[PDB]
Design an enzyme around this catalytic site. Sequence first.
Site, PDB file in Angstrom:
ATOM      1  N   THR A  81       2.275 -22.794   3.453  1.00  0.00           N
ATOM      2  CA  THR A  81       1.055 -22.454   2.792  1.00  0.00           C
ATOM      3  C   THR A  81       0.216 -21.643   3.757  1.00  0.00           C
ATOM      4  OG1 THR A  81       0.036 -24.501   3.655  1.00  0.00           O
ATOM      5  CG2 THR A  81       0.914 -24.628   1.456  1.00  0.00           C
ATOM      6  N   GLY A  82      -0.703 -20.869   3.218  1.00  0.00           N
ATOM      7  CA  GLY A  82      -1.700 -20.153   4.044  1.00  0.00           C
ATOM      8  C   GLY A  82      -3.013 -19.951   3.281  1.00  0.00           C
TER       9      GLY A  82
ATOM     10  N   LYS B 241       1.645 -17.371  10.838  1.00  0.00           N
ATOM     11  CA  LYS B 241       2.405 -18.160  11.853  1.00  0.00           C
ATOM     12  C   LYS B 241       3.922 -17.980  11.738  1.00  0.00           C
ATOM     13  CE  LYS B 241      -0.973 -21.953  11.976  1.00  0.00           C
ATOM     14  NZ  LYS B 241      -2.201 -21.349  11.373  1.00  0.00           N
TER      15      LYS B 241
ATOM     16  N   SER C 113      -2.334 -18.659   7.294  1.00  0.00           N
ATOM     17  CA  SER C 113      -1.367 -19.331   8.186  1.00  0.00           C
ATOM     18  C   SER C 113       0.065 -18.941   7.923  1.00  0.00           C
ATOM     19  CB  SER C 113      -1.549 -20.857   8.133  1.00  0.00           C
ATOM     20  OG  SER C 113      -2.813 -21.173   8.683  1.00  0.00           O
TER      21      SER C 113
HETATM   22  B1  LIG Z   1      -3.695 -21.853   7.766  1.00  0.00           B
HETATM   23  O1  LIG Z   1      -4.073 -20.959   6.574  1.00  0.00           O
HETATM   24  C1  LIG Z   1      -5.010 -22.077   8.652  1.00  0.00           C
HETATM   25  N1  LIG Z   1      -6.113 -22.535   7.776  1.00  0.00           N
HETATM   26  S1  LIG Z   1      -7.535 -22.696   8.565  1.00  0.00           S
HETATM   27  O2  LIG Z   1      -8.139 -23.802   7.869  1.00  0.00           O
HETATM   28  O3  LIG Z   1      -7.364 -23.002   9.973  1.00  0.00           O
HETATM   29  C2  LIG Z   1      -8.450 -21.362   8.444  1.00  0.00           C
HETATM   30  C3  LIG Z   1      -8.383 -20.332   9.410  1.00  0.00           C
HETATM   31  C4  LIG Z   1      -9.177 -19.174   9.284  1.00  0.00           C
HETATM   32  C5  LIG Z   1     -10.070 -19.050   8.227  1.00  0.00           C
HETATM   33  C6  LIG Z   1     -10.939 -17.832   8.045  1.00  0.00           C
HETATM   34  N2  LIG Z   1     -11.361 -17.162   9.136  1.00  0.00           N
HETATM   35  N3  LIG Z   1     -12.146 -16.036   8.787  1.00  0.00           N
HETATM   36  N4  LIG Z   1     -12.146 -16.072   7.385  1.00  0.00           N
HETATM   37  N5  LIG Z   1     -11.385 -17.196   6.938  1.00  0.00           N
HETATM   38  C7  LIG Z   1     -10.145 -20.073   7.268  1.00  0.00           C
HETATM   39  C8  LIG Z   1      -9.346 -21.215   7.364  1.00  0.00           C
HETATM   40  O4  LIG Z   1      -3.143 -23.143   7.429  1.00  0.00           O
HETATM   41  P1  LIG Z   1      -3.170 -23.790   5.973  1.00  0.00           P
HETATM   42  O5  LIG Z   1      -2.168 -23.265   4.972  1.00  0.00           O
HETATM   43  O6  LIG Z   1      -4.548 -23.631   5.385  1.00  0.00           O
HETATM   44  O7  LIG Z   1      -2.802 -25.258   6.073  1.00  0.00           O
END
Ligand SMILES: *[B@]([O])([C][N]S(=O)(=O)C1=[C][C]=C(C2=NN=N[N]2)[C]=[C]1)OP([O])([O])=O
Length: 355
Positions: free
Chosen positions: A310-311, A64, A61
């Site tokens: 965070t990501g 973003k 993320s």
């Molecule tokens: B972002 O990192 C989004 N986190 S998520 O929980 O939506 C997410 C998206 C994609 C994956 C993934 N897709 N293919 N492999 N892994 C996993 C998790 O926000 P944040 O920092 O986590 O709040």
Amino acid sequence: KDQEIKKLVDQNFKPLLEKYDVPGMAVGVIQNNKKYEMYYGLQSVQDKKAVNSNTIFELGSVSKLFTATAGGYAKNKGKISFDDTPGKYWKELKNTPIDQVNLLQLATYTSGNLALQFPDEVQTDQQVLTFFKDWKPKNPIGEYRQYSNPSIGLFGKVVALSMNKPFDQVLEKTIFPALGLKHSYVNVPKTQMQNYAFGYNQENQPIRVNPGPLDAPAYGVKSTLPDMLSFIHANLNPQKYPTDIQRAINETHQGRYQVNTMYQALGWEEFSYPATLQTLLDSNSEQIVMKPNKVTAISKEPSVKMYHKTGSTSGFGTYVVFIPKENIGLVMLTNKRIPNEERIKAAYVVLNAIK
Ligand SMILES: *[B@]([O])([C][N]S(=O)(=O)C1=[C][C]=C(C2=NN=N[N]2)[C]=[C]1)OP([O])([O])=O
């Protein structure tokens, strides 16, 4: 005291590798336009290949932030307005209920009916469209924040439309070159594949990110530690950058609304500096990240700001933080997901300790 940066990072970040069995870590600090790169462990366990400055990590993320930057750049070139609605750019959404949501609201997760992920059955170009056509409101538009990949993902796709290029080419051909980035990609090319770390899941199996609907704008960028450090430098010290990208950057720093102590800027989360540890921790609490919260207008406009994000992907963790008035920032990249609190806490002790 320059000589302490390394020791601080070893005291606070290094123990997380044993504690969470993480194969590889890169931690960068930038201070007064001087960069510090700390590398730990392995980019690939099976190949015994070291983490170094060429290592490419998934940002999750933190991606973003690039999307938000691409939005700011398109606003200031006059290609979009944040008061516009997506139907103006994606014809097929004109006059639909989602075309009452403006571009800012999509970017900042306040459409009032969009969850964290698309449904798993949503995958193709057509299913994505179909989903947005069938969309109907739930909470009053603009009043409720729910953190959401589809919301900012659509904002991303609209920005690419307004630029007449697909989203991946917006970043790789416009935004990454304007920031001085040499090794940042939506799609890691053939010739860099030996630099791309494996991620490792919670059973320590090596994995990489999977395709998904509007993945690029939402979670699809990969980068190295030096590149990320340059991005933080752009954010801390944008006078050196082209006017266009400077205005973009500045646009991402403007808080749009508050959820108690957390201000939502474009991509970034903004806080009053100094922030307490708990303020920074509670920003990625289950409540804030997982459930709707009613926002308010910014009441207290912070005079001295700090920003973080965070990501995560399934195999990678990322944390990025900067404080303009201290001319300092930090980047942590791991190839195993570790709790957000740990990343946040470690960065808090290091950045506090350096002054
Ligand atoms: B972002 O990192 C989004 N986190 S998520 O929980 O939506 C997410 C998206 C994609 C994956 C993934 N897709 N293919 N492999 N892994 C996993 C998790 O926000 P944040 O920092 O986590 O709040």
